[PDB]
């Protein structure tokens, strides 16, 4: 085959272009014959002249163009040339890579570029990656609008997720403003994530206006399609920093590597067309005379030629003549004037590269560990992540929601994990255990859960006010009216052996041991592994009464596979207490928390949350 490639500017003859192709794909039955010419300077008259002149010396069946230039027009000129020669031309860099008008169907042209819909898609993927759900679009009358809106409308609409489009703004750069009408619109929008679409210069004006409006400042973020960043060589600092935009790469594929890809595409296309018809692609190149006969056959090649692959990598083009999911790099404006790569994206898929840690434990009311959907890979809905050293577990429930609301009101951020050692806080011999340890070790600032309150822990750590009425209580099948009757005090007084037990290492058990020794020493035999298992001892028989926290026992009273279980008396509990929350000591956010708590009931949210999480179906009947 006969092929030609050209490089413009850089002021250089460079070895690397041979190095580029490094006699690449020599293996292919058909060999490329290459003639290289470079031009220090380009002109539509110069560029037009040189390639045809080269047609006269080389009679090449394909051309690759490359430039140092920022110039938009060159690509389009080359499209015209494709129309003229009916000889394929493509380009690996610069202006030829820069986007152009929709290509004539008859014409054969390729660019290392993309489109508008694809870019919008990448913007959406980027937003999805950072999970920025809520966004607005500021656009201008510049071409592609409301097709941008349309593409977004489909892309945003199809997905199940409830992301929000806040505003779409269309402002004409023409009829330039004394009114600062752009300021007047732009100032209005409250959204955190902004997609902008316009000419580069217009972007300058819109950004000056945004800087006046205050839209550029922290927490709001801007995202841009390819056009505004352009070359990226020159960046008026009128653009805000942290500006996020998409662009073509230039490192993942050296100028020589890209040329090698182009040569490979031309010769691969030649090879596929050969394999199909066993026919030489070579054709008379001369523009001046009429197009050579049998050039019309080349048409079929293009239809066939659209997807070309080398190195197990797709150069596959699209109907516009841009490569399919061309190396498309996610780029950001690094501090100062730097443009630094962040993510890479290709084809369908994209890949991009006051603390107060809280510890909890899994219980019944307001506290449930669930295993997240593996396909999803991350937690869903109300579930908030919690880690357990032994793996990510997903915690959700009443307490989780309360924590979320308190945090929302006081406006701070937090890390949540699960306790390993000793569950609920326990004093054994000299030393404490459980979440309280991590509160003491300062491995947890505040501990949240079904944790009960007692004098010792209030002594060591400040506690939040009780949100719920709870305490020690009994759960039994259908006994103690006095409930202090001492029938509990001694089993032995009653000739048949009686039975009652509770979970060990509990505030209940410690309290019991403190006040009533005999009960503890007797009940150690009736102690049970877990609340589900304690329930197993009650439910299947072999145990008469069960004793546990009143909130849990009441919720379990309400929730049972059959209404076989009920509370004791009115469920009016001795040791009247409520669930608190740990803090370190006298120094803490402290009171600020407390206020938040009573705002929660203050708006009546707790009743709703009670109906949803705490309310059981049972005990309606009685």
């Amino acid at each position: 085959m006969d092929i030609a490639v050209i490089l413009v500017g850089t002021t250089e003859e460079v070895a690397i272009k041979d190095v580029h192709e490094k006699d690449d794909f020599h293996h292919l039955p058909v060999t490329p014959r290459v003639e290289l010419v470079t031009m220090q300077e380009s002109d539509p008259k110069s560029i037009i002249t040189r390639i045809c002149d080269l047609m006269s010396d080389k009679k090449v069946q394909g051309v690759v163009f490359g430039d140092d230039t920022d110039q938009e027009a060159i690509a389009q000129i080359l499209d015209f040339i494709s129309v003229q020669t009916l000889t394929p031309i493509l380009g690996i860099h610069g202006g030829s890579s820069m986007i152009m008008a929709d290509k004539e169907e008859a014409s054969m042209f390729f660019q290392f570029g993309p489109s508008i819909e694809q870019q919008a898609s990448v913007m959406l993927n980027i937003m999805e990656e950072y999970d920025w759900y809520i966004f607005s679009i500021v656009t201008t009358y510049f071409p592609g609008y409301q097709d941008f809106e349309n593409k977004v409308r489909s892309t945003i609409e199809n997905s199940f997720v409830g992301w929000e489009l806040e505003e779409v703004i269309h402002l004409d750069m023409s009829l330039d403003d004394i009114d600062s009408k752009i300021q007047n619109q732009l100032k209005k929008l409250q959204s955190p994530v902004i997609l902008l679409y316009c000419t580069k210069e217009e972007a300058t004006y819109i950004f000056e206006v945004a800087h006046s409006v205050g839209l550029t400042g922290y927490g709001f973020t801007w995202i841009v399609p390819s056009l505004v960043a352009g070359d990226t060589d020159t960046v008026p600092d009128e653009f805000p920093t942290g500006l996020i935009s998409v662009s073509y790469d230039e490192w993942d594929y050296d100028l020589p590597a890209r040329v090698r890809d182009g040569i490979a595409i031309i010769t691969t296309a030649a090879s596929t067309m050969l394999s199909e018809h066993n026919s030489i692609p070579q054709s008379k190149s001369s523009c001046n005379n009429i197009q050579e006969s049998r050039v019309y056959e080349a048409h079929m090649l293009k239809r066939y030629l659209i997807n070309v692959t080398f190195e197990g990598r797709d150069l596959s083009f699209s109907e516009d003549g841009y490569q399919m999911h061309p190396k498309l790099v996610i780029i950001l404006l690094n501090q100062e004037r730097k443009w630094e790569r962040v993510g890479k994206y290709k084809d369908r898929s994209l890949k991009m590269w006051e603390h107060l840690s809280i510890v909890t434990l899994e219980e019944a009311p307001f506290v449930i560990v669930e295993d997240v959907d593996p396909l999803s890979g991350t937690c869903m809905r109300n579930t908030v992540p919690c880690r357990k050293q032994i793996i990510k577990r997903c915690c959700k429930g009443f307490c989780i929601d309360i924590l979320k609301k308190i945090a929302k009101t006081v406006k701070f951020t937090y890390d949540l994990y699960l306790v390993t050692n000793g569950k609920h806080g326990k004093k054994i011999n000299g030393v404490w255990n459980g979440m309280i340890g991590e509160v003491v070790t300062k491995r947890a600032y505040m501990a949240v859960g079904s944790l009960t309150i007692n004098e010792e822990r209030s002594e060591v750590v400040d506690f939040s006010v009780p949100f719920i009425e709870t305490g020690i209580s009994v759960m039994v099948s259908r006994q103690v009216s006095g409930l202090s009757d001492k029938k509990f005090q001694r089993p032995n007084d009653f000739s048949p052996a009686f039975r009652f037990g509770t979970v060990p290492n509990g505030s209940t058990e410690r309290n019991i041991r403190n006040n009533y020794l005999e009960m503890h020493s007797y009940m150690v035999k009736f102690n049970q592994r877990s609340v589900q298992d304690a329930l197993l001892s009650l439910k299947s028989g072999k145990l008469d009464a069960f004793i546990y926290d009143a909130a849990v026992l009441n919720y379990m009273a309400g929730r049972d596979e059959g209404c076989k279980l009920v509370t004791i008396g009115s469920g009016k509990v001795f040791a009247t207490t409520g669930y608190g929350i740990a803090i370190q000591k006298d120094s803490g956010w402290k009171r600020q928390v407390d206020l938040a708590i009573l705002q929660l009931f203050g708006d009546g949210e707790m009743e709703e949350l009670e109906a949803l999480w705490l309310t059981g179906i049972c005990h309606n009947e009685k």
Partner: protein
């Protein structure tokens, strides 16, 4: 089953099944609606 909102539904059980057809419009009610979105999975 006391109501459309049945505590028995609200108190689901592996032991007590409640059955439907996937892709039945009811399923669309379950997926589209956020308020009961938790209840859909059971």
């Amino acid at each position: 089953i006391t109501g459309i909102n049945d505590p028995r539904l609200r108190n689901p059980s592996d032991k007590f099944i409640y059955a439907t057809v996937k892709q039945s419009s009811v399923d669309i009610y379950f997926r589209r609606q956020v308020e009961l979105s938790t209840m859909y999975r059971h």
